[PDB]
Amino acid sequence: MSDRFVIWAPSMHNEPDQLFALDSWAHRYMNKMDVVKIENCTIGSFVEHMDVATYDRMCNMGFRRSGKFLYKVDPLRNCCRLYTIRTAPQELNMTKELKKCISRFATRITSEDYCPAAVASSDFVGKIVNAEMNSKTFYTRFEPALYSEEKYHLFVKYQEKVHQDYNNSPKSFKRFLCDTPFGPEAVLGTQESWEQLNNWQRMKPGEKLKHMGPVHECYYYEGKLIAITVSDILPSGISSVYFIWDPDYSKWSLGKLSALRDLAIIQRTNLQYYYLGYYYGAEVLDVCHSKYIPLKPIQDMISRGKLFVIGEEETKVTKELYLVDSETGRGEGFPTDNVVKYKNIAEEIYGVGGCAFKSANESALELKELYGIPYEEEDLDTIYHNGIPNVVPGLLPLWELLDIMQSGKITDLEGRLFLFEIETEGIRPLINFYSEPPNVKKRICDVIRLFGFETCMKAVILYSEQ
Numbered sequence: 001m002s003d004r005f006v007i008w009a010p011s012m013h014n015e016p017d018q019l020f021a022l023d024s025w026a027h028r029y030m031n032k033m034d035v036v037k038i039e040n041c042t043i044g045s046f047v048e049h050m051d052v053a054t055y056d057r058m059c060n061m062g063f064r065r066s067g068k069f070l071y072k073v074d075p076l077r078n079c080c081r082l083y084t085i086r087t088a089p090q091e092l093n094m095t096k097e098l099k100k101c102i103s104r105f106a107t108r109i110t111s112e113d114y115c116p117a118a119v120a121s122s123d124f125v126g127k128i129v130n131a132e133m134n135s136k137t138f139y140t141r142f143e144p145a146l147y148s149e150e151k152y153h154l155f156v157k158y159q160e161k162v163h164q165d166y167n168n169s170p171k172s173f174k175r176f177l178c179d180t181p182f183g184p185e186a187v188l189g190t191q192e193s194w195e196q197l198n199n200w201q202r203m204k205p206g207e208k209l210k211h212m213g214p215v216h217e218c219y220y221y222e223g224k225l226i227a228i229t230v231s232d233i234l235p236s237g238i239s240s241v242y243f244i245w246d247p248d249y250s251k252w253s254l255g256k257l258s259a260l261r262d263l264a265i266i267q268r269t270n271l272q273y274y275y276l277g278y279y280y281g282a283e284v285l286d287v288c289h290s291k292y293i294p295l296k297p298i299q300d301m302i303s304r305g306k307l308f309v310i311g312e313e314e315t316k317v318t319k320e321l322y323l324v325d326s327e328t329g330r331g332e333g334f335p336t337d338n339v340v341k342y343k344n345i346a347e348e349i350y351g352v353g354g355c356a357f358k359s360a361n362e363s364a365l366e367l368k369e370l371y372g373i374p375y376e377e378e379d380l381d382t383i384y385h386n387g388i389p390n391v392v393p394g395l396l397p398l399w400e401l402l403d404i405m406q407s408g409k410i411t412d413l414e415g416r417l418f419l420f421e422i423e424t425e426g427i428r429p430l431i432n433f434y435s436e437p438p439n440v441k442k443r444i445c446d447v448i449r450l451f452g453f454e455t456c457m458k459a460v461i462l463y464s465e466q
Contacts, residue, residue, distance in 0.1 A: 002051040002183055006460045007070070009443040010045035010450050012388055016066055021076045021307035024351030029384065036384045038079045043388055043395075043450065044071025047181035048462065052212045054455065055181070056234040057329035059084070061452070062287045062394055064277045065232070065241070067179040075287065075393045076350050077383055081305045084285035086237070086292060086331070087274050089267040091281030092260075094122040101253045102260060106131040108252075109138035109221075125264040129201045137222050140261075142197045144188050145214040147178050150225055154244060161247040177216075177230045177242055186213030197233075200268050209233075209269040214241070219254070227254050229262065236331065237266055237273035273331075283333065286310045287394030288321050288349075290328040293342070301344065307393065310334060311345035320349055320356045320397035325453045350393060352382075360390040363398035371405045371434065373441045388446055396449040404453065410434075412453075413444065418460040427460065439465060 019038055020026035029036055044063070047070045055065065062084040063072045073082040092098075102124050106116065110131050119126045132138065152173050159165040180187060193211040196203070203209070212233055219227035226249050230241040240262065245254040259274075266274050276282075279302065283292035288309045301308045311317070334342070349356045357379050364375035375398070378390045390398055404410050410433050417430040419440065433441065443463055448456045 002049070003458055004049065004460055005054055005451070005455050005458050006047070006049040007447070007451075007462065008046040008048070009461055009463045010043065010388065010446050012386075013042045013044060013069075013071065015040045016042045016044070016069055016071060017304055017306070019079045019305075021078075021081060022347050022351045023306075024347050024354070025383065028352060038384065039074075039077060040079050041074060041077070042069075042071040043074055043392065044069055045447075045450070046070075049183060050181045052182060052186055052232070052234055054458075055232065055239075056236055057455070058451065059232075059234065059239050059275055059329075060236075060285070060331040061290060061329040062277075062285050064239075065181065067175045067177070068181045070181065072394065074389070075307050076391070077389065081302075081307060082277060083279045083302055084287075085276040085279055085282050085295065086285075087263070087276070087280060087282045088237075088272060089125065089263045089274075091283075092124070092263060093280045094124055098124065098256060098260060101256045102127055105252070105257055109135040111136065124260055125267050128261060128264045129268070133201060139220055141218045141220070142194065142211075142215050143218065144194075145178050145180060145216050145230065146187075147174050151216065151218070151228055154225055154228060154246060157246060158244045162245075180214045182213050189213065197269070200265050203268050203270070205270055207270060209271060219245075219258075221249070226252075227258060229258050231262065233271075234275075237271045237275060238262055239275040240278065286334075288323075289334070290323060290330070290394075291332045291334055293334050297342070298344070307346045307350065308344040309346040309349060309393070310342050312338070312340040313343045313345060314340070316348045316355075317345065318355050319359050319399055320391070320393075322400060323396060323452075328452050346393075350391070356391045356397070357383075360398045363402045364390055367398065367402055367405065367445075371441070372438055373405070373445055374438045375442070375445075388449070396452070401445060401449055404448070409453070413457060416457040417444070420460055420462045422462055422464045 017023065017026045047068050058070060063070050075081050099122065106127055114134055116127060117130060119130065147170065152170050155173050156168045159168050189211050197209065197211045212235065214232050217229035217231060218225055227243070227245040229243050232239040232241060243255065243258050263274050280295065282295035284295050284298065284302065286293050286309065293310050298308055348354065361377040361380065364377055367373045367375040375390065413430055413433060415429065418427050419430055420427045443461060444456070447459055447461060
């Protein structure tokens with residue numbers, strides 16, 4: 001039925017300071033601009049089926065999904081960096097640009113008969129809700145992420161007049177915002193769970209929200225469709241896929257209004273977090289730890305789209321940091337009061353002199369020579385010049401992968417992992433990792449390095465040789 005993670009073998013995809021992750025690299029390559037160029041490149045996997053608990057985990061590993069494509073950015077080599085951000089309704093610093101946004105929303109959707117019922121000065125949920133229930137002109141409908149003409153036509157308009165994007169077809173809209181790697185129950189649900197989500201303003205703290213999975217939230221004003229939020233509703237909260245709005249309603253700040261509404265929906269449905277990616281008392285994911293760190297101390301760096309690795313700097317590390325497989329993607333945080341202050345140690349691992357590289361290459365040599373897995377030395381010289389790189393922040397470091405081979409842990413996949421060579425009959429159990437051919441071991445390594453050993457134990461890997 002669902003707990004199986006059914007995925008195509010992962011790979012580097014084409015395109016699904018300011019451009020350098022570390023000042024190390026920028027300093028030695030700008031005055032020398034013309035000789036290099038920098039990829040735009042995702043790493044990821046086409047997912048045929050996954051449940052939403054697993055995607056919740058992948059989310060908190062810093063993955064996002066575009067349609068059925070589960071992916072992340074190489075935070076070291078790519079021209080731009082993606083940050084996974086989570087916020088809760090209560091950590092939202094209610095600035096006034098937000099308070100103004102909410103306030104004009106309220107007056108536009110309400111009448112003149114009534115006005116804010118002694119609501120608190122920054123209770124954005126209370127104003128948002130009670131304005132909406134005392135409104136005759138504005139509402140929203142949560143519905144299944146399914147194609148329709150009205151939705152596509154608004155999408156096209158938003159794409160053209162807000163992104164100068166004339167590359168639209170229904171097929172392309174379908175693939176991006178209606179195709180999902182989830183099963184039919186998570187997509188279509190039941191009338192009763194749709195009816196409860198659409199009554200989220202009437203939900204109280206006892207209640208547990210029943211619909212989990214992808215949704216389209218349609219905004220209607222005076223019977224006209226003016227925005228669509230595409231969102232994944234997960235056990236821990238809401239992950240934001242995309243937001244479409246009509247250019248005509250630009251002076252509504254529908255971008256900001258949607259985010260607050262999403263958070264008010266988080267609160268009233270007794271869910272926990274709102275996940276932005278796509279970039280306050282927010283928290284940003286350190287992917288080298290797979291934990292969150294409070295945002296404001298290191299806005300110093302997302303400001304400049306820069307790669308950061310939180311550390312204490314008691315020594316200068318000599319290896320990429322150790323990821324605990326039970327702990328990855330669980331959204332743990334760092335400790336609150338540390339005797340040390342946290343420094344960003346990314347240059348000592350991943351910069352020009354960085355330790356990660358020869359440690360990777362020494363392991364690739366043992367990976368190939370001792371276990372017959374085709375890894376080879378990369379980046380000995382710089383990182384700017386096939387497949388997933390040996391060193392990628394947030395992927396399992398090779399020295400650690402190598403310990404799975406050498407300890408025998410790798411054989412734990414024997415009897416749990418399945419392989420689907422798509423030109424053969426069909427699925428076959430993994431019976432002897434070491435007796436598999438090299439390009440199969442490599443794929444298994446890649447899934448391990450990317451989605452983690454636990455998830456790989458419930459994986460079915462689709463591949464075609466040659």
